[PDB]
Write a protein that binds this ligand. Structure first.
Ligand SMILES: *[C@@H]1O[C@H](CO)[C@@H](O)[C@H](O)[C@H]1NC(C)=O
Ligand SMILES: *[C@@H]1O[C@H](CO)[C@@H](O)[C@H](O)[C@H]1NC(C)=O
Ligand SMILES: *[C@@H]1O[C@H](CO)[C@@H](O)[C@H](O)[C@H]1NC(C)=O
Ligand SMILES: *[C@@H]1O[C@H](CO)[C@@H](O)[C@H](O)[C@H]1NC(C)=O
Ligand SMILES: *[C@@H]1O[C@H](CO)[C@@H](O)[C@H](O)[C@H]1NC(C)=O
Ligand SMILES: *[C@@H]1O[C@H](CO)[C@@H](O)[C@H](O)[C@H]1NC(C)=O
Ligand SMILES: *[C@@H]1O[C@H](CO)[C@@H](O)[C@H](O)[C@H]1NC(C)=O
Lengths: 595, 201
């Protein structure tokens, strides 16, 4: 019946391309000036856009997908025919919205106190995270850690007890087995010969891949344990799991804050070029222009005039309330902007490359029909932003563009320190993402009873990650609830899949660029074969199965860990040579509170 | 041979307002001395697409009528205004013949036509039951039928109002900015002296 459906979608664009732009701008304006006026305007525009989607969706549902032969029309119809919200009755809908707003609020306002020192009352993200990041006081760290679990985690738990029912009912109303299954639909390909991917396939691919990742993790884990035992000599067992509160963050998601304890060759300097930027009189504009040069040098378009005239590159020059957590925007109608507060430092330099990488992806698929203007799947926007940053950061690049001295010599020890810091950031997080999603999927699925949620949460963390709680918490607690992505209803597996895609892309593009050395030394700057190769995928948006879109660049229809292992193999080799006087792997019986 | 009855091109390229593309204007120019050089040597235009006559000949050519068609479109649609083209403008808002004798001239009007909040005063036709003939204009506002029923002239299931507004805003990116387009169509019927380039000795 595409005579009617394609006609409907042409009318849809005729409204949608504007209403989204009004909503989109109101959101932008709010973030650049936080005031009640903008709050009301973004909320009103938001509701108009949502109402328009609901009405439009109702009309889209007249056109059965099974009548549609044209895939482009079928995909567009699948995108707005989604039921989702309002499949449930109004009371159920309002109750779920109430719960979700409550969860978000408990997390964001969850001010936790030290009973022995009231001046220590704080929220997580300002100041309380400093204790978990940088203190080496075992008991101080524990007080912070335990206090968040008892003051925020327990309070969120009952919202989860009801939430998983409401979300599963919604998912069932939308014909999914449960909410985990609902989320996994993002990777589904169904109806394209040779590119199909069932939802349950993600689980098998994630578990299979994880097993292949483990050896890298086990050696990294052993190394880190060997070093943490010097920092915490009466607390950590040589053959056991690491205490959770000693991993550098409120949940132990990243091991980056352990770097200062684990640095392989502490006598060596970093490749931190903040001083070069400062001494050379760089400013935010210079940083973004260098990032622009990076992308155009490989065949990508330059930034638009709008971007340079209306983006927010720096913080306000006055006492202005604004939010600028770095982020890329596609505001609609070819309006692309970046929002951030750039300081002259290496971290923001790399952030600018990351965010502009997202913008380049958004520009590339701008030609797609409105409903297909997104990345291939949830993990691809970041896989692209991360490879742009990863290449910009290599010493070869930094020396070539003037950040490292002409007399800079890279050596044996520098390489190891570099790779370890990245391994702590990446390898050290893969088991976190893997474990958390496996648990949430099991919870939504009904495999883990509500009276066994923490029993399995901690059993799984010890068996999968090798991390043990300092306190044998009972079922009144809900550790994962205390994490932002869980309290605010986000999928999490996207980080796992993104990491794997990141390395598959870096290797394919490095080879396209005809690099002659190690994978971690890849720089595809000023190389157009690699740039065009990636571009040809970026431009597809949602028009192709992500499996197809991926094959076009990396030669595979699925995730592949080898590029990750190849990236870190030189570190692994060192880690295997290290630990000749230590144990690799861990038991799950021992705990820091055992006696 | 001195000249003073010059053609009023200085108005039509320079107008306070242009028509909606669905209802484009037709300015008949006749009984006058042309000087196309003030157009071709202008830096104000981004587009000069000549299909018949050319910028290097026009200064010396005679025609019996020149017609300046004029309207506002979205920038991505500039490419459709040409012989041999298709697309929502070429097919049904404004069609040029495949053997078009003239030149298409266009420029960005973002600072004239775009407004903060959206300039919705420029309409384009989203639907027709057929394609237009060259230089045909269709200004019907009846409801477009996509389904089995005319639905008695209302918007509804498979019933659409054919004319939609362009949401032009100063912050839109290029291609979503408004463009002003003037098309010079040339013909020679009976008495060519009716429009000519400059006169000398
Ligand atoms: C504050 O919000 C107002 C909206 O009235 C806006 O005009 C103003 O520019 C904003 N301030 C800044 C610094 O953007
Ligand atoms: C989907 O639309 C494209 C547009 O060019 C068309 O070529 C394609 O044939 C359509 N699909 C089918 C099965 O007709
Ligand atoms: C989801 O599909 C069912 C099928 O009958 C329909 O009744 C329902 O209204 C749709 N819901 C939404 C929110 O689109
Ligand atoms: C982007 O525009 C600038 C303007 O100076 C130009 O120098 C640069 O080469 C352009 N890049 C591309 C990819 O066109
Ligand atoms: C440093 O270079 C020397 C060259 O003899 C090599 O033997 C040594 O193993 C390198 N250092 C590291 C940490 O690999
Ligand atoms: C940029 O491209 C030029 C082309 O000769 C090359 O010489 C230069 O080293 C490249 N710069 C970087 C940072 O790769
Ligand atoms: C239009 O008005 C401008 C005003 O500066 C003038 O320069 C130009 O010659 C006029 N004529 C045309 C055809 O643009």
């Amino acid at each position: 019946i595409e005579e009617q459906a394609k006609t409907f979608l042409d009318f849809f664009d005729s409204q949608a391309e504007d209403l989204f732009y009004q909503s989109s701008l109101a959101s932008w304006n709010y973030n650049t000036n936080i005031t009640e006026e903008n709050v009301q305007n973004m909320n009103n525009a938001g509701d108009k856009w949502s109402a328009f989607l609901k009405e439009q969706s109702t009309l889209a549902q007249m056109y059965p997908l099974q009548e549609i032969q044209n895939l482009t029309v079928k995909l567009q119809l699948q995108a707005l025919q989604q039921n989702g919200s309002s499949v449930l009755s109004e009371d159920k809908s309002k109750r779920l919205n109430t719960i979700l707003n409550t969860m978000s609020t408990i997390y964001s306002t969850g001010k936790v106190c030290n009973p022995d020192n009231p001046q220590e009352c704080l929220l997580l993200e300002p100041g309380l995270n400093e204790i978990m990041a940088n203190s080496l006081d075992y008991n101080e760290r524990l007080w912070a850690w335990e206090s968040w679990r008892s003051e925020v985690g327990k309070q969120l738990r009952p919202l989860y007890e009801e939430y998983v029912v409401l979300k599963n009912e919604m998912a069932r109303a939308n014909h999914y087995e449960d909410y985990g299954d609902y989320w996994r639909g993002d990777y589904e390909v169904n109806g394209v010969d040779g590119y199909d991917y069932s939802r349950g396939q993600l689980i098998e691919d994630v578990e299979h891949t994880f097993e292949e990742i483990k050896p890298l993790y086990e050696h990294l884990h052993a190394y880190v344990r060997a070093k943490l035992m010097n920092a915490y000599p009466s607390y950590i067992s040589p053959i056991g799991c690491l205490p959770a509160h000693l991993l550098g963050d409120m949940w132990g998601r990243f091991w980056t804050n352990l770097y200062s304890l684990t640095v392989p060759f502490g006598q060596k300097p970093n490749i931190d070029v903040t001083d070069a930027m400062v001494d050379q009189a760089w400013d935010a504009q210079r940083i973004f222009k260098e990032a622009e040069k990076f992308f155009v040098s490989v065949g990508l378009p330059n930034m638009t005039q709008g971007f340079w005239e209306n983006s927010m590159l720096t913080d306000p020059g006055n006492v202005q309330k604004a939010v600028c957590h770095p982020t890329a925007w596609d505001l609609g109608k070819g309006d692309f902007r970046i929002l951030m507060c750039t300081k002259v430092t290496m971290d923001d330099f790399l952030t600018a490359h990351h965010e502009m990488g997202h913008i380049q992806y958004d520009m590339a698929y701008a030609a797609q029909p409105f409903l297909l203007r997104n990345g291939a799947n949830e993990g691809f926007h970041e896989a692209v932003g991360e490879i742009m940053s990863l290449s910009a950061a290599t010493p070869k690049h930094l020396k070539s563009i003037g950040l490292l001295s002409p007399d800079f010599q890279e050596d044996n020890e520098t390489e190891i320190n570099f790779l370890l810091k990245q391994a702590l950031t990446i390898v050290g997080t893969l088991p976190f993402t893997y474990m958390l999603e496996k648990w949430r999927w099991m919870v939504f699925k009904g495999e883990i009873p509500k009276d066994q949620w923490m029993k399995k949460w901690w059993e799984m963390k010890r068996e999968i990650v090798g991390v043990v709680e300092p306190v044998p918490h009972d079922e009144t607690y809900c550790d994962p609830a205390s994490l932002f992505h869980v309290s605010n209803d986000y999928s999490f597996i996207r980080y796992y899949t993104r990491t794997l895609y990141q390395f598959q892309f870096q290797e394919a593009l490095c080879q396209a660029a005809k690099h002659e050395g190690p994978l971690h030394k890849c720089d595809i700057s000023n190389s157009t074969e690699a740039g065009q190769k990636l571009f040809n995928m970026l431009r597809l948006g949602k028009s192709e199965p992500w499996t197809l879109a991926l094959e076009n660049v990396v030669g595979a229809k699925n995730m592949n860990v080898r590029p990750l292992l190849n990236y870190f193999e030189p570190l692994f080799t060192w880690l295997k040579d290290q630990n000749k006087n230590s144990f690799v792997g861990w038991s799950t019986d021992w705990s820091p509170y055992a006696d | 041979p001195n000249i003073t009855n010059l053609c009023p091109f200085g108005e039509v390229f320079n107008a306070t307002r242009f028509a909606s593309v669905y209802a484009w204007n037709r300015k008949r120019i006749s009984n006058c001395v042309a000087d196309y050089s003030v157009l071709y040597n202008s830096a104000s235009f981004s587009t000069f697409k000549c299909y018949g006559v050319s910028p290097t000949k026009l200064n010396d050519l005679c025609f019996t009528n020149v017609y300046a068609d004029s309207f506002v479109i979205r920038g991505d649609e500039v490419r459709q205004i040409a012989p041999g083209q298709t697309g929502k403008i070429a097919d049904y808002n404004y069609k040029l013949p495949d053997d078009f004798t003239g030149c298409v001239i266009a420029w960005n009007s973002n600072n004239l036509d775009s407004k903060v909040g959206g300039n919705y005063n420029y309409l384009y036709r989203l639907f027709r039951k057929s394609n237009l003939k060259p230089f045909e204009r269709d200004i019907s506002t009846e409801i477009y039928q996509a389904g089995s029923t005319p639905c008695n002239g209302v918007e509804g299931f498979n019933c659409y109002f054919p004319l939609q507004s362009y949401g032009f805003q100063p912050t839109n990116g290029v291609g979503y900015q408004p463009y002003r387009v003037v098309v010079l169509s040339f013909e020679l019927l009976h008495a060519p002296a009716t429009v000519c380039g400059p006169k000398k000795s």
